[PDB]
Amino acid sequence: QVQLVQSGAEVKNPGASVKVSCAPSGYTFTDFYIHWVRLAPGQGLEWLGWMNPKTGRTNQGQNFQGRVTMTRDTSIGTAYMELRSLTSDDTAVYYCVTGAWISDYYDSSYYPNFDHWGQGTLVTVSGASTKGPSVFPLAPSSKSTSGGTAALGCLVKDYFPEPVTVSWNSGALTSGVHTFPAVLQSSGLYSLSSVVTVPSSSLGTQTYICNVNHKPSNTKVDKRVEPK
């Protein structure tokens, strides 16, 4: 059972640096090359570099030279990649991966043989500042209120960074819940909506509450969504 354990999601301002760690387990850390790669929107898979954990010798992609540094602490079996002068181009998911076995007899540093992958580290580069959402009710129609079914929801507005999660009635209500992926607005803030379809015969008696969790700002709001 090999597992590559990476550090958690990071949010950075343009111009800042980020350092991601990777602690591989399930094999001997100094026996295999470590590579760093990323998946960035509209750029595909990009190779940052390789590091030999035995010697600390590294090589960087030519488009990363001068702004990425790879190091390791063998005493804790941990690899690090630091990327400097971040811009929106650097918003991506970064992966530590295992590469070829390290031999004294031949150079396999550049074998693109990535058997095992870390869980990925999201870095988001933005000038936006952390902010909890405003939560507004999306009331069911005056018209759908008549037996049958009605759609109602919560508008989770102007928050940063991702993610927010939404449940309904503390997770007691799951059937017919659709939470939409957030939109990233021109302000750099996100908004999303979550809607649930309920029998319209139920509106007014049965209480509907959307539970919005925005952990990055340490806020939760439980918002009642009522007719009218």
Partner: protein, 212 residues
């Protein structure tokens, strides 16, 4: 970067091939091409290495070849579950690796659907906070390509519009949403606002009005 076609399509059971074109310095140089399959939400998966070899556990429906400066991944017995992004990587000269832009595989023949559109007016509470957002939620459409236009009364409105790219739902149709931001005075001073959603076969329009 190595160049891959952005999109490849096939019907179930059929064979498709994904190309990966480099130069004499990378792909054509050595037999060091690998392929990775990426289902978003999961880490990419090792499929092929050294041009044509299989890692343990990988289905032999995927096969790899190389001619000149171009590597190819071939997928046989094509299944809907093969829908993914596929990336090639190669030794890139000077002890480096170079990777491709990726190729999205689409499996043809999947159930199509018109978008369902739900449009909410600004809430009383938001107005009372001196703000106004119209919310247009769009779901169940396939294929996953839609254009969303807003109108104030009967005329196009572009200012204050934010629209998401479509994203796949659990049932393999798509969902998107669009938001129109107004001042409360703008909301109240108009006859109506509409969200109109054009899909390949139809346009669906929903309208709301401050006079409710």
């Amino acid at each position: 970067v190595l160049t891959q076609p952005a999109s490849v399509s096939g019907s179930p059971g059929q064979s498709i091939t994904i190309s990966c074109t480099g130069t004499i310095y990378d792909v054509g140089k050595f037999d060091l091409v690998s392929w990775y399959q990426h289902h978003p939400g999961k880490a990419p998966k090792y499929l092929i290495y050294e041009v044509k070899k299989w890692p343990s556990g990988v289905s032999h429906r995927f096969s790899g070849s190389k001619s000149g400066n171009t590597a190819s991944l071939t997928i046989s017995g094509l299944q809907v579950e093969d829908e993914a992004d596929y990336y090639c990587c190669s030794f890139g000269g000077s002890a480096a690796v170079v990777c491709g832009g990726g190729t999205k595989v689409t499996v043809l023949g999947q159930p199509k659907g018109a978008p369902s559109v739900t449009l909410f007016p600004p809430s009383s509470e938001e107005l009372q906070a001196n703000k106004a957002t119209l919310v247009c939620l769009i779901s169940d459409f396939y294929p996953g390509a839609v254009t969303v236009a807003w109108k104030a009364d009967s005329s196009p409105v572009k200012a204050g519009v934010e629209t998401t790219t479509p994203s796949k739902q659990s049932n393999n149709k798509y969902a998107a949403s669009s938001y129109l931001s107004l001042t409360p005075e703008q909301w109240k001073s108009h006859r109506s606002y509409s969200c109109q959603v054009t899909h390949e076969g139809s346009t669906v329009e929903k309208t709301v009005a401050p006079t409710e």
